[PDB]
Amino acid sequence: SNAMLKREMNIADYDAELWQAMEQEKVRQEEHIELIASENYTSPRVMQAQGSQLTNKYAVDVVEQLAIDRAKELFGADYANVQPHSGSQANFAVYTALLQPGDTVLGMNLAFSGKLYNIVPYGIDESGKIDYDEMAKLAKEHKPKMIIGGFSAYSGVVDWAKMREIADSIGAYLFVDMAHVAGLIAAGVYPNPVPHAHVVTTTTHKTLAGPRGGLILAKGGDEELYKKLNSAVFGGPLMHVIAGKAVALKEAMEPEFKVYQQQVAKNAKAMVEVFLNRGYKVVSGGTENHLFLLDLVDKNLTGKEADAALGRANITVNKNSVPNDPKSPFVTSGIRIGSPAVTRRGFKEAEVKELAGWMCDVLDNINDEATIERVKAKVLDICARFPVYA
Amino acid sequence: SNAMLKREMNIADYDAELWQAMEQEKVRQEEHIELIASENYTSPRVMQAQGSQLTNKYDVVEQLAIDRAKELFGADYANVQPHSGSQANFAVYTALLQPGDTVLGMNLYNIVPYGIDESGKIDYDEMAKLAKEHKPKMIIGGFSAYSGVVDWAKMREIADSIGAYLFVDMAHVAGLIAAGVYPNPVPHAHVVTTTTHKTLAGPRGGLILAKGGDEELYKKLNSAVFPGGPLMHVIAGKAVALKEAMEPEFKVYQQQVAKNAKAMVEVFLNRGYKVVSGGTENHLFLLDLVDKNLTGKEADAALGRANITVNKNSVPNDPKSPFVTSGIRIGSPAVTRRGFKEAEVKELAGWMCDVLDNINDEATIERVKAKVLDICARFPVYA
């Protein structure tokens, strides 16, 4: 025999370098305030699934059917495919199922798929709000085969019903990638694109708080579409990750998850209030979801500057361009902030308001070491009061 | 306190439905003999990494994987980010090819296939004919049911003669390559890819490796991987799996893999079965059942009744559909992992011949099943 004994076979016994790195990553997740809008803390049940012997399975079916059934129940889809390894892979399945090389696609942005297809962008104005009349004119002008909804840095709510009308008016597909807001949709606090788009994709981590992976959903499609989508996905699925998806999707149906998402939305609003009250500009002047963009043009700061300074105080954000950004995309004039992770670890309005205030202290004094050190200390204290896995 | 994040309530407590399905799979892995050539049993250290908080990360960990991949394979470039072998391959294509380019491969882009004969041996002269006539931008080496050695040096000569890239997908033999007991493509290819879970016995995932290129090439390969983020928990799994593969015991393992495959081959041949190519030089082989009036699908099902798992596979010039086939593909990595040596695999191969000789003899099926279960019980995978 040659049994692999779990008590004798662990990382700390065998691979000290890896173990030290893993320990330091747990410490980082605990003692940093994570405001990257795509970040979250998955449950220990998701982690248990991902650590399981399902990694050995070549593809089982019951585990997969639970994920599929739960995806359909949660989002009200008549079709779900839980196999994609990532949101990007889900998206690529959709493109290859429905598009030909060199087709025109209308996407949205701030004012490889780009290499294979002709992507025309609808750019949100300095107003920071979608203008559906203008979107309809771009659609009419360019006659895309597909309009793609979903954008990583929009703080407004997208009217998917209206987008479907625009798509239909020119015979295009509406594809919505809801990766950036899926958890809010799952909770009923943001509108669902499943009844309006021809196909929908998402990641399962981010606001859904599950494992990293993809999902394709649809409602009202024909057998033929569903068949094409299935065939475009692959090269088998990660069954341990699919188990992760199954348990995450059930967690998403808990009343606690609805309360959590309501808190996510309140928290993002409370942070916006502070930034505005401290003299910072927020794109659109508000948020209606979990995230927002701080426009630093009037401060003569770059997003890269802001991000580095905040990082020195154990606050993680990402840079992001603003509408008609006067700076290059490598630099930007904005940062994007979201509440899911801090909310997940127990921060409510008081904490996020205090945090926003500290961020304003940093940005007001971006090369003052003492401010940075003071704020770092406060961040560490707040992190201790609100531990993650406890 | 965060009710959803505290460790109190595990999957069994929370989601009995899911837990039951997970634990059935666990018991299935113990109670069946697995001869699907792409399957293995990864270590508990790999699973521990996959179960870690690294799933929440949006880099010392990645460097460890990169360094260990380069060391194991003798490469001066590695990318450990791909989610799968397929994504690794896709990265290479999108890095080096333009849409509609011509490509040559074994069994978006104009593909010219090269087809090994009934002899079950690669015809380098036919490969050369196709390459030199059609002038592909890239020749792709590596194929899933091939039991022979491949002359990677010769493929590079062919590629070099027409100015083409040589890409080798070594997924189907990577662990043997790593242990030095199968020809190494890394010195000869422009770029190589692999999965991390079959003969490497690691997590499911992809890898890109290369040597002898400049940073410009390596930058292109990096840029091509995500056309989002890596799975850092899986990458930690890769790091520890790659370290395990550097142990002298891993080479011993692969030597036993190769020896066991040859041993099973000898039984099939001696029992009147035909083996594509007449033998093996690696961990797998293909039985050609045409002369038995058997389909691969039916052979797969018959063996499954006795708790022996194989997969159907087309043979050269298969008279049957690809969904039916006239062959089965058998590999030794998983049985060897759980401790089978030559004596055990020889006995196993005899039982398989007993079933296939008389698929409808339920007495034989039941006899073999009981022996299979006894054998599985004394070779537990995990404890």
Side-chain angles (χ1 to χ4, degrees), chain A residues 357-386:
Chain A
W358 304 333
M359 294 167 76
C360 289
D361 300 334
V362 167
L363 295 184
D364 284 354
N365 294 294
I366 205 157
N367 56 358
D368 172 25
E369 183 61 33
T371 301
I372 291 167
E373 291 170 4
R374 279 201 298 273
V375 166
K376 183 168 180 184
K378 289 194 273 208
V379 164
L380 295 170
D381 284 343
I382 301 284
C383 281
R385 200 170 334 112
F386 297 96

PDB file of all heavy atoms in Angstrom, chain A residues 357-386:
ATOM      1  N   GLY A 357     -13.333  59.037   6.028  1.00  0.00           N
ATOM      2  CA  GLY A 357     -12.711  60.236   6.551  1.00  0.00           C
ATOM      3  C   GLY A 357     -11.190  60.123   6.578  1.00  0.00           C
ATOM      4  O   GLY A 357     -10.474  61.046   6.234  1.00  0.00           O
ATOM      5  N   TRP A 358     -10.692  58.986   7.021  1.00  0.00           N
ATOM      6  CA  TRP A 358      -9.237  58.732   7.015  1.00  0.00           C
ATOM      7  C   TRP A 358      -8.640  58.794   5.616  1.00  0.00           C
ATOM      8  O   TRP A 358      -7.514  59.270   5.435  1.00  0.00           O
ATOM      9  CB  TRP A 358      -8.930  57.351   7.613  1.00  0.00           C
ATOM     10  CG  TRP A 358      -9.464  57.156   8.974  1.00  0.00           C
ATOM     11  CD1 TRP A 358      -9.716  58.105   9.903  1.00  0.00           C
ATOM     12  CD2 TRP A 358      -9.735  55.903   9.594  1.00  0.00           C
ATOM     13  NE1 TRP A 358     -10.164  57.525  11.065  1.00  0.00           N
ATOM     14  CE2 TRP A 358     -10.194  56.177  10.889  1.00  0.00           C
ATOM     15  CE3 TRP A 358      -9.684  54.573   9.151  1.00  0.00           C
ATOM     16  CZ2 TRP A 358     -10.552  55.176  11.780  1.00  0.00           C
ATOM     17  CZ3 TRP A 358     -10.056  53.578  10.018  1.00  0.00           C
ATOM     18  CH2 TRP A 358     -10.479  53.891  11.323  1.00  0.00           C
ATOM     19  N   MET A 359      -9.379  58.286   4.638  1.00  0.00           N
ATOM     20  CA  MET A 359      -8.920  58.275   3.266  1.00  0.00           C
ATOM     21  C   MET A 359      -8.794  59.716   2.764  1.00  0.00           C
ATOM     22  O   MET A 359      -7.832  60.054   2.058  1.00  0.00           O
ATOM     23  CB  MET A 359      -9.860  57.439   2.374  1.00  0.00           C
ATOM     24  CG  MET A 359      -9.871  55.913   2.719  1.00  0.00           C
ATOM     25  SD  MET A 359     -11.300  54.961   1.888  1.00  0.00           S
ATOM     26  CE  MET A 359     -10.477  54.956   0.200  1.00  0.00           C
ATOM     27  N   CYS A 360      -9.753  60.543   3.149  1.00  0.00           N
ATOM     28  CA  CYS A 360      -9.709  61.967   2.823  1.00  0.00           C
ATOM     29  C   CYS A 360      -8.514  62.629   3.538  1.00  0.00           C
ATOM     30  O   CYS A 360      -7.849  63.490   2.971  1.00  0.00           O
ATOM     31  CB  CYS A 360     -11.013  62.622   3.238  1.00  0.00           C
ATOM     32  SG  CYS A 360     -12.383  62.113   2.174  1.00  0.00           S
ATOM     33  N   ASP A 361      -8.236  62.241   4.776  1.00  0.00           N
ATOM     34  CA  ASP A 361      -7.037  62.795   5.463  1.00  0.00           C
ATOM     35  C   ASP A 361      -5.751  62.466   4.659  1.00  0.00           C
ATOM     36  O   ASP A 361      -4.849  63.327   4.481  1.00  0.00           O
ATOM     37  CB  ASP A 361      -6.902  62.278   6.900  1.00  0.00           C
ATOM     38  CG  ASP A 361      -8.092  62.617   7.797  1.00  0.00           C
ATOM     39  OD1 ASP A 361      -8.784  63.599   7.552  1.00  0.00           O
ATOM     40  OD2 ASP A 361      -8.335  61.848   8.765  1.00  0.00           O
ATOM     41  N   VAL A 362      -5.677  61.233   4.140  1.00  0.00           N
ATOM     42  CA  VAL A 362      -4.524  60.809   3.350  1.00  0.00           C
ATOM     43  C   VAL A 362      -4.467  61.622   2.069  1.00  0.00           C
ATOM     44  O   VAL A 362      -3.418  62.197   1.737  1.00  0.00           O
ATOM     45  CB  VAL A 362      -4.517  59.273   3.044  1.00  0.00           C
ATOM     46  CG1 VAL A 362      -3.452  58.931   1.943  1.00  0.00           C
ATOM     47  CG2 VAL A 362      -4.259  58.476   4.332  1.00  0.00           C
ATOM     48  N   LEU A 363      -5.574  61.695   1.354  1.00  0.00           N
ATOM     49  CA  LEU A 363      -5.578  62.356   0.061  1.00  0.00           C
ATOM     50  C   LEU A 363      -5.351  63.879   0.134  1.00  0.00           C
ATOM     51  O   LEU A 363      -4.763  64.461  -0.782  1.00  0.00           O
ATOM     52  CB  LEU A 363      -6.840  61.976  -0.704  1.00  0.00           C
ATOM     53  CG  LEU A 363      -6.933  60.484  -1.070  1.00  0.00           C
ATOM     54  CD1 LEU A 363      -8.145  60.225  -1.896  1.00  0.00           C
ATOM     55  CD2 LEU A 363      -5.650  59.993  -1.800  1.00  0.00           C
ATOM     56  N   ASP A 364      -5.806  64.488   1.230  1.00  0.00           N
ATOM     57  CA  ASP A 364      -5.547  65.886   1.593  1.00  0.00           C
ATOM     58  C   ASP A 364      -4.073  66.149   1.893  1.00  0.00           C
ATOM     59  O   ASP A 364      -3.597  67.282   1.796  1.00  0.00           O
ATOM     60  CB  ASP A 364      -6.323  66.248   2.871  1.00  0.00           C
ATOM     61  CG  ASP A 364      -7.799  66.470   2.643  1.00  0.00           C
ATOM     62  OD1 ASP A 364      -8.276  66.467   1.491  1.00  0.00           O
ATOM     63  OD2 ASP A 364      -8.483  66.668   3.656  1.00  0.00           O
ATOM     64  N   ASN A 365      -3.351  65.107   2.269  1.00  0.00           N
ATOM     65  CA  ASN A 365      -1.968  65.232   2.740  1.00  0.00           C
ATOM     66  C   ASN A 365      -1.122  64.119   2.214  1.00  0.00           C
ATOM     67  O   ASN A 365      -0.482  63.411   2.972  1.00  0.00           O
ATOM     68  CB  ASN A 365      -1.934  65.131   4.254  1.00  0.00           C
ATOM     69  CG  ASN A 365      -2.624  66.263   4.907  1.00  0.00           C
ATOM     70  OD1 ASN A 365      -2.174  67.392   4.802  1.00  0.00           O
ATOM     71  ND2 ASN A 365      -3.744  65.978   5.588  1.00  0.00           N
ATOM     72  N   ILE A 366      -1.076  63.992   0.910  1.00  0.00           N
ATOM     73  CA  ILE A 366      -0.605  62.750   0.290  1.00  0.00           C
ATOM     74  C   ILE A 366       0.895  62.390   0.472  1.00  0.00           C
ATOM     75  O   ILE A 366       1.272  61.200   0.349  1.00  0.00           O
ATOM     76  CB  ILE A 366      -0.989  62.772  -1.225  1.00  0.00           C
ATOM     77  CG1 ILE A 366      -1.106  61.355  -1.746  1.00  0.00           C
ATOM     78  CG2 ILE A 366       0.001  63.637  -2.024  1.00  0.00           C
ATOM     79  CD1 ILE A 366      -1.938  61.247  -2.936  1.00  0.00           C
ATOM     80  N   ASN A 367       1.735  63.387   0.773  1.00  0.00           N
ATOM     81  CA  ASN A 367       3.158  63.140   1.119  1.00  0.00           C
ATOM     82  C   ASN A 367       3.500  63.542   2.548  1.00  0.00           C
ATOM     83  O   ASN A 367       4.632  63.953   2.840  1.00  0.00           O
ATOM     84  CB  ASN A 367       4.080  63.832   0.141  1.00  0.00           C
ATOM     85  CG  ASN A 367       3.806  65.318   0.059  1.00  0.00           C
ATOM     86  OD1 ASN A 367       2.888  65.801   0.719  1.00  0.00           O
ATOM     87  ND2 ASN A 367       4.593  66.054  -0.749  1.00  0.00           N
ATOM     88  N   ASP A 368       2.529  63.417   3.455  1.00  0.00           N
ATOM     89  CA  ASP A 368       2.793  63.601   4.885  1.00  0.00           C
ATOM     90  C   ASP A 368       2.834  62.251   5.578  1.00  0.00           C
ATOM     91  O   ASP A 368       1.793  61.614   5.832  1.00  0.00           O
ATOM     92  CB  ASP A 368       1.717  64.456   5.544  1.00  0.00           C
ATOM     93  CG  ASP A 368       1.866  64.496   7.081  1.00  0.00           C
ATOM     94  OD1 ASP A 368       2.989  64.294   7.602  1.00  0.00           O
ATOM     95  OD2 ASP A 368       0.850  64.683   7.746  1.00  0.00           O
ATOM     96  N   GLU A 369       4.044  61.820   5.874  1.00  0.00           N
ATOM     97  CA  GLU A 369       4.295  60.523   6.506  1.00  0.00           C
ATOM     98  C   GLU A 369       3.505  60.325   7.799  1.00  0.00           C
ATOM     99  O   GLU A 369       3.030  59.210   8.077  1.00  0.00           O
ATOM    100  CB  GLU A 369       5.791  60.390   6.761  1.00  0.00           C
ATOM    101  CG  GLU A 369       6.232  59.069   7.355  1.00  0.00           C
ATOM    102  CD  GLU A 369       5.921  57.875   6.494  1.00  0.00           C
ATOM    103  OE1 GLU A 369       5.960  58.036   5.248  1.00  0.00           O
ATOM    104  OE2 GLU A 369       5.676  56.765   7.069  1.00  0.00           O
ATOM    105  N   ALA A 370       3.356  61.390   8.577  1.00  0.00           N
ATOM    106  CA  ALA A 370       2.702  61.275   9.890  1.00  0.00           C
ATOM    107  C   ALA A 370       1.223  60.955   9.735  1.00  0.00           C
ATOM    108  O   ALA A 370       0.685  60.154  10.476  1.00  0.00           O
ATOM    109  CB  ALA A 370       2.919  62.550  10.738  1.00  0.00           C
ATOM    110  N   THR A 371       0.566  61.560   8.762  1.00  0.00           N
ATOM    111  CA  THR A 371      -0.848  61.241   8.478  1.00  0.00           C
ATOM    112  C   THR A 371      -1.010  59.791   8.054  1.00  0.00           C
ATOM    113  O   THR A 371      -1.855  59.074   8.594  1.00  0.00           O
ATOM    114  CB  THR A 371      -1.431  62.129   7.353  1.00  0.00           C
ATOM    115  OG1 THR A 371      -1.342  63.485   7.733  1.00  0.00           O
ATOM    116  CG2 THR A 371      -2.873  61.762   7.065  1.00  0.00           C
ATOM    117  N   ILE A 372      -0.184  59.363   7.124  1.00  0.00           N
ATOM    118  CA  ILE A 372      -0.161  57.992   6.697  1.00  0.00           C
ATOM    119  C   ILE A 372       0.052  57.003   7.848  1.00  0.00           C
ATOM    120  O   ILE A 372      -0.733  56.043   7.981  1.00  0.00           O
ATOM    121  CB  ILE A 372       0.814  57.787   5.533  1.00  0.00           C
ATOM    122  CG1 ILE A 372       0.237  58.487   4.271  1.00  0.00           C
ATOM    123  CG2 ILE A 372       0.968  56.260   5.217  1.00  0.00           C
ATOM    124  CD1 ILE A 372       1.196  58.633   3.162  1.00  0.00           C
ATOM    125  N   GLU A 373       1.018  57.277   8.716  1.00  0.00           N
ATOM    126  CA  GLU A 373       1.259  56.422   9.899  1.00  0.00           C
ATOM    127  C   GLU A 373       0.087  56.421  10.878  1.00  0.00           C
ATOM    128  O   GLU A 373      -0.257  55.362  11.417  1.00  0.00           O
ATOM    129  CB  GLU A 373       2.555  56.809  10.606  1.00  0.00           C
ATOM    130  CG  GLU A 373       3.804  56.455   9.745  1.00  0.00           C
ATOM    131  CD  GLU A 373       5.119  57.030  10.278  1.00  0.00           C
ATOM    132  OE1 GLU A 373       5.147  57.655  11.363  1.00  0.00           O
ATOM    133  OE2 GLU A 373       6.141  56.848   9.598  1.00  0.00           O
ATOM    134  N   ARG A 374      -0.523  57.591  11.091  1.00  0.00           N
ATOM    135  CA  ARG A 374      -1.680  57.708  11.983  1.00  0.00           C
ATOM    136  C   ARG A 374      -2.869  56.909  11.500  1.00  0.00           C
ATOM    137  O   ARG A 374      -3.551  56.202  12.288  1.00  0.00           O
ATOM    138  CB  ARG A 374      -2.095  59.164  12.122  1.00  0.00           C
ATOM    139  CG  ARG A 374      -1.239  59.928  13.130  1.00  0.00           C
ATOM    140  CD  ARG A 374      -1.941  61.188  13.652  1.00  0.00           C
ATOM    141  NE  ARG A 374      -2.190  62.119  12.558  1.00  0.00           N
ATOM    142  CZ  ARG A 374      -1.327  63.037  12.128  1.00  0.00           C
ATOM    143  NH1 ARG A 374      -0.126  63.193  12.710  1.00  0.00           N
ATOM    144  NH2 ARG A 374      -1.677  63.823  11.121  1.00  0.00           N
ATOM    145  N   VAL A 375      -3.131  57.031  10.211  1.00  0.00           N
ATOM    146  CA  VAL A 375      -4.232  56.330   9.596  1.00  0.00           C
ATOM    147  C   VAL A 375      -3.947  54.823   9.601  1.00  0.00           C
ATOM    148  O   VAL A 375      -4.845  54.042   9.950  1.00  0.00           O
ATOM    149  CB  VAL A 375      -4.512  56.840   8.168  1.00  0.00           C
ATOM    150  CG1 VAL A 375      -5.454  55.884   7.365  1.00  0.00           C
ATOM    151  CG2 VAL A 375      -5.080  58.263   8.223  1.00  0.00           C
ATOM    152  N   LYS A 376      -2.721  54.412   9.279  1.00  0.00           N
ATOM    153  CA  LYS A 376      -2.372  52.982   9.340  1.00  0.00           C
ATOM    154  C   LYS A 376      -2.705  52.387  10.700  1.00  0.00           C
ATOM    155  O   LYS A 376      -3.275  51.307  10.797  1.00  0.00           O
ATOM    156  CB  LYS A 376      -0.901  52.729   9.031  1.00  0.00           C
ATOM    157  CG  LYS A 376      -0.540  51.236   9.013  1.00  0.00           C
ATOM    158  CD  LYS A 376       0.868  51.039   8.392  1.00  0.00           C
ATOM    159  CE  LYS A 376       1.283  49.577   8.337  1.00  0.00           C
ATOM    160  NZ  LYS A 376       2.678  49.494   7.832  1.00  0.00           N
ATOM    161  N   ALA A 377      -2.372  53.099  11.761  1.00  0.00           N
ATOM    162  CA  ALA A 377      -2.658  52.610  13.085  1.00  0.00           C
ATOM    163  C   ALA A 377      -4.148  52.451  13.340  1.00  0.00           C
ATOM    164  O   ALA A 377      -4.589  51.503  13.998  1.00  0.00           O
ATOM    165  CB  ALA A 377      -2.050  53.548  14.133  1.00  0.00           C
ATOM    166  N   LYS A 378      -4.932  53.402  12.865  1.00  0.00           N
ATOM    167  CA  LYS A 378      -6.376  53.330  13.047  1.00  0.00           C
ATOM    168  C   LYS A 378      -6.951  52.186  12.255  1.00  0.00           C
ATOM    169  O   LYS A 378      -7.897  51.543  12.715  1.00  0.00           O
ATOM    170  CB  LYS A 378      -7.045  54.657  12.634  1.00  0.00           C
ATOM    171  CG  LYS A 378      -6.743  55.763  13.628  1.00  0.00           C
ATOM    172  CD  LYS A 378      -7.638  56.950  13.441  1.00  0.00           C
ATOM    173  CE  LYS A 378      -7.103  57.919  12.419  1.00  0.00           C
ATOM    174  NZ  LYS A 378      -7.585  59.307  12.749  1.00  0.00           N
ATOM    175  N   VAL A 379      -6.416  51.965  11.055  1.00  0.00           N
ATOM    176  CA  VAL A 379      -6.880  50.864  10.196  1.00  0.00           C
ATOM    177  C   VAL A 379      -6.643  49.533  10.923  1.00  0.00           C
ATOM    178  O   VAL A 379      -7.549  48.662  10.996  1.00  0.00           O
ATOM    179  CB  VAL A 379      -6.183  50.871   8.831  1.00  0.00           C
ATOM    180  CG1 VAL A 379      -6.358  49.546   8.097  1.00  0.00           C
ATOM    181  CG2 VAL A 379      -6.721  52.049   7.997  1.00  0.00           C
ATOM    182  N   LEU A 380      -5.463  49.392  11.509  1.00  0.00           N
ATOM    183  CA  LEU A 380      -5.105  48.150  12.241  1.00  0.00           C
ATOM    184  C   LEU A 380      -6.010  47.923  13.445  1.00  0.00           C
ATOM    185  O   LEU A 380      -6.463  46.815  13.700  1.00  0.00           O
ATOM    186  CB  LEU A 380      -3.636  48.152  12.685  1.00  0.00           C
ATOM    187  CG  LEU A 380      -2.580  48.140  11.570  1.00  0.00           C
ATOM    188  CD1 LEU A 380      -1.164  48.396  12.150  1.00  0.00           C
ATOM    189  CD2 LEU A 380      -2.622  46.811  10.786  1.00  0.00           C
ATOM    190  N   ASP A 381      -6.321  48.980  14.158  1.00  0.00           N
ATOM    191  CA  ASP A 381      -7.253  48.872  15.274  1.00  0.00           C
ATOM    192  C   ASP A 381      -8.680  48.469  14.828  1.00  0.00           C
ATOM    193  O   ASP A 381      -9.318  47.631  15.468  1.00  0.00           O
ATOM    194  CB  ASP A 381      -7.322  50.183  16.058  1.00  0.00           C
ATOM    195  CG  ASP A 381      -6.118  50.381  16.952  1.00  0.00           C
ATOM    196  OD1 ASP A 381      -5.406  49.382  17.218  1.00  0.00           O
ATOM    197  OD2 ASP A 381      -5.874  51.532  17.386  1.00  0.00           O
ATOM    198  N   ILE A 382      -9.183  49.075  13.764  1.00  0.00           N
ATOM    199  CA  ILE A 382     -10.507  48.722  13.246  1.00  0.00           C
ATOM    200  C   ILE A 382     -10.552  47.292  12.775  1.00  0.00           C
ATOM    201  O   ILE A 382     -11.517  46.571  13.028  1.00  0.00           O
ATOM    202  CB  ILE A 382     -10.919  49.588  12.083  1.00  0.00           C
ATOM    203  CG1 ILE A 382     -10.941  51.037  12.505  1.00  0.00           C
ATOM    204  CG2 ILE A 382     -12.320  49.235  11.588  1.00  0.00           C
ATOM    205  CD1 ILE A 382     -12.108  51.461  13.349  1.00  0.00           C
ATOM    206  N   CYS A 383      -9.494  46.874  12.081  1.00  0.00           N
ATOM    207  CA  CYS A 383      -9.368  45.472  11.623  1.00  0.00           C
ATOM    208  C   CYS A 383      -9.423  44.496  12.800  1.00  0.00           C
ATOM    209  O   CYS A 383     -10.133  43.488  12.754  1.00  0.00           O
ATOM    210  CB  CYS A 383      -8.077  45.278  10.821  1.00  0.00           C
ATOM    211  SG  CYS A 383      -8.333  45.926   9.132  1.00  0.00           S
ATOM    212  N   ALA A 384      -8.733  44.830  13.888  1.00  0.00           N
ATOM    213  CA  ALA A 384      -8.811  44.001  15.094  1.00  0.00           C
ATOM    214  C   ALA A 384     -10.208  43.924  15.709  1.00  0.00           C
ATOM    215  O   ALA A 384     -10.597  42.892  16.265  1.00  0.00           O
ATOM    216  CB  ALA A 384      -7.788  44.471  16.170  1.00  0.00           C
ATOM    217  N   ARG A 385     -10.966  45.018  15.644  1.00  0.00           N
ATOM    218  CA  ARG A 385     -12.329  45.039  16.183  1.00  0.00           C
ATOM    219  C   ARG A 385     -13.320  44.263  15.291  1.00  0.00           C
ATOM    220  O   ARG A 385     -14.365  43.784  15.744  1.00  0.00           O
ATOM    221  CB  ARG A 385     -12.758  46.514  16.354  1.00  0.00           C
ATOM    222  CG  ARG A 385     -13.909  46.732  17.328  1.00  0.00           C
ATOM    223  CD  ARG A 385     -14.158  48.225  17.686  1.00  0.00           C
ATOM    224  NE  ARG A 385     -12.967  49.071  17.544  1.00  0.00           N
ATOM    225  CZ  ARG A 385     -12.820  50.024  16.614  1.00  0.00           C
ATOM    226  NH1 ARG A 385     -13.799  50.299  15.741  1.00  0.00           N
ATOM    227  NH2 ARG A 385     -11.686  50.720  16.553  1.00  0.00           N
ATOM    228  N   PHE A 386     -12.988  44.127  14.020  1.00  0.00           N
ATOM    229  CA  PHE A 386     -13.830  43.459  13.036  1.00  0.00           C
ATOM    230  C   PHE A 386     -13.070  42.362  12.298  1.00  0.00           C
ATOM    231  O   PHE A 386     -12.715  42.512  11.118  1.00  0.00           O
ATOM    232  CB  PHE A 386     -14.422  44.492  12.057  1.00  0.00           C
ATOM    233  CG  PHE A 386     -15.319  45.467  12.732  1.00  0.00           C
ATOM    234  CD1 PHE A 386     -14.838  46.688  13.133  1.00  0.00           C
ATOM    235  CD2 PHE A 386     -16.627  45.153  13.005  1.00  0.00           C
ATOM    236  CE1 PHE A 386     -15.648  47.618  13.769  1.00  0.00           C
ATOM    237  CE2 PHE A 386     -17.446  46.069  13.659  1.00  0.00           C
ATOM    238  CZ  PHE A 386     -16.936  47.316  14.042  1.00  0.00           C
TER     239      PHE A 386
END
